[PDB]
Amino acid sequence: SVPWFPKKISDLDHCANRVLMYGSELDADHPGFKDNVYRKRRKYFADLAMNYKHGDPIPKVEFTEEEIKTWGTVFQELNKLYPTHACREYLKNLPLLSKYCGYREDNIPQLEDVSNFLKERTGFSIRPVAGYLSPRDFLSGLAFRVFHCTQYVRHSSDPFYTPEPDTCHELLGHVPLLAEPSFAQFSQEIGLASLGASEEAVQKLATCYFFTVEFGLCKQDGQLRVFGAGLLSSISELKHALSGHAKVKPFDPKITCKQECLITTFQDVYFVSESFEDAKEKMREFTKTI
Numbered sequence: 001s002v003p004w005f006p007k008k009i010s011d012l013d014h015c016a017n018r019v020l021m022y023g024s025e026l027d028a029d030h031p032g033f034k035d036n037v038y039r040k041r042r043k044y045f046a047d048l049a050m051n052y053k054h055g056d057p058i059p060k061v062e063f064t065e066e067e068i069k070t071w072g073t074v075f076q077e078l079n080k081l082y083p084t085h086a087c088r089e090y091l092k093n094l095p096l097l098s099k100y101c102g103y104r105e106d107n108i109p110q111l112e113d114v115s116n117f118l119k120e121r122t123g124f125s126i127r128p129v130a131g132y133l134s135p136r137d138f139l140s141g142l143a144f145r146v147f148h149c150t151q152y153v154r155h156s157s158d159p160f161y162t163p164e165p166d167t168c169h170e171l172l173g174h175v176p177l178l179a180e181p182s183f184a185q186f187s188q189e190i191g192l193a194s195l196g197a198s199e200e201a202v203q204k205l206a207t208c209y210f211f212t213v214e215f216g217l218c219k220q221d222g223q224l225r226v227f228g229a230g231l232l233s234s235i236s237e238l239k240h241a242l243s244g245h246a247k248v249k250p251f252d253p254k255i256t257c258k259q260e261c262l263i264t265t266f267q268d269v270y271f272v273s274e275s276f277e278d279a280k281e282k283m284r285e286f287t288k289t290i
């Protein structure tokens with residue numbers, strides 16, 4: 001029996017509010033685990049996502065100057081690295097987001113503006129998410145070109161805190177590539193493949209997603225470049241990825257899906273896609289077997 005899956009974009013209303021672990025219930029090792037002010041702020045962001053329904057404009061948020069500063073610091077340092085690290089598709093769309101969506105050191109972009117930009121570019125849109133979803137539900141969003149996005153900012157105490165996604169990771173890591181048609185097609189086809197798929201096939205697709213969309217490397221004009229959003233929002237690992245101290249394998253779904261996804265350290269291995277079009281072709285061949 002096929003499990004329930006969303007049939008239209010508004011059906012994600014019934015997936016999105018199935019959060020297994022809420023964004024306000026912080027990890028024990030979270031930098032703001034003892035910060036009562038930060039906890040209330042996270043509960044505010046999580047209620048915004050919980051009350052969101054498809055069709056709504058995404059609520060616009062007044063970030064605090066503390067939150068702006070944290071973004072600014074991350075923004076400054078990553079932008080020094082992008083020209084020598086990021087893939088050409090990333091570098092092409094970043095300036096368009098500074099122009100149209102307010103990407104500045106002194107301004108955190110709003111998800112609604114970014115979502116309206118993505119809709120025009122690739123038909124991708126944003127949905128604020130109140131915490132961790134099952135891989136089935138999270139990936140099911142991509143089937144309708146919906147990216148479930150966190151809206152909160154990481155704790156100001158530790159601005160290089162990379163384990164959980166925050167809105168800095170979404171905006172600097174994911175969005176510039178969701179504005180690229182070839183990548184948007186690749187992402188959506190992961191989403192389509194998981195709709196009603198077995199729990200086994202969902203987990204394999206999630207693992208391929210992790211080592212492409214989140215931590216992928218690609219070869220361009222003979223060079224290794226970064227396109228994974230988790231690398232593009234992590235100063236330390238972005239540098240580590242294109243250094244000679246990291247192990248690298250070609251992207252191959254049948255081998256890639258066996259790799260453990262690490263959470264609290266650098267990845268043990270990164271997979272290199274030849275291009276987004278080729279990765280998409282490899283996933284097409286792979287999904288037919290699962």
Ligand SMILES: CCn1c(=O)[nH]c(=O)c2c1nc(Cc1cn3c(n1)CCCC3)n2Cc1cccc(C(=O)NC[C@H](N)C(=O)OC)c1
Pocket residue numbers: 021027129131132133134135136138139148150162163164165169206209210214229230
């Ligand atoms: C396909 C796998 N996947 C999934 O099955 N479900 C998701 O909901 C999900 C996801 N993949 C991303 C997107 C993502 C995740 N990461 C990065 N981008 C950048 C590198 C760090 C991890 N999400 C959305 C999401 C939203 C909110 C929280 C978490 C979360 O991982 N919380 C930390 C930890 N899980 C936790 O709850 O406490 C131990 C993830």
Ligand SMILES: [Fe+3]
Pocket residue numbers: 165169173174214229230
């Ligand atoms: Fe991510």
